[PDB]
Amino acid sequence: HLIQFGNMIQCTVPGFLSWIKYADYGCYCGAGGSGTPVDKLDRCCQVHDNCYTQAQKLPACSSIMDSPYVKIYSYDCSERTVTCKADNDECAAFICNCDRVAAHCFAASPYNNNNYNIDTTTRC
Ligand SMILES: [Ca+2]
């Protein structure tokens, strides 16, 4: 669930920026995505998008399109590290890993303010 994804971000990069700073960034962090990723962080989002597209195709998710957005999974946070618990079913587990990888990718990427809330219909 997107709400959990938000908490993961709070897990890997504590006390830096609010969730909204990674919700509308570059050509990929935020509704839809197209063009070339403006930077490494944007690149994290591009992969996350694909991951979500893969979840919708994954047989384990029964073709329920909104699965990666609302499906509730089980994860853990400790020492700024996120892990997906084993008590997750196939679909939930895949979605959890999509977010897990993204959260860690964000934390390992520099944040460029000039790429926040940009005009996608010009830079993408
Ligand atoms: Ca997107």
Domain assignments of the chain as residue spans, ordered by start: 1-124
Dihedral of the CA atoms 70, 94, 39, 22 (nearest 10)?
A: 30
Active site residue 24: no
In CATH terms, the fold of domain 1-124 is Phospholipase A2 (1.20.90)
Active site residue 48: yes
By what method was this entry solved? X-ray
Count of residues making up the chain: 124
Cα gap 79→32, rounded to integer Å:
32
Cα gap 85→23, rounded to integer Å:
25
Residues 6+ apart with CB under 8 A from 12: 80, 81, 82, 103, 104, 106, 107
Which tokens hold the place of 91? 């679909």
Annotated binding site for Ca(2+): 28, 30, 32, 49
Query: Could you tell me the end-to-end alpha-carbon distance of the chain, in angstroms, rounded to an integer?
Result: 27
Buried b (16+ CB within 10 A) or exposed e, 88-115: beebbbbbbbbbbbbbbbbbebebeeeb
Buried b (16+ CB within 10 A) or exposed e, 40-77: ebbbbbbebbebbeebeebeebeeeeebbeebebebee
- Give 34 Cα–ligand 1 centroid separation in angstroms: 8
User: Which of 89, 99, 104, 119 is flagged as catalytic?
Assistant: 99
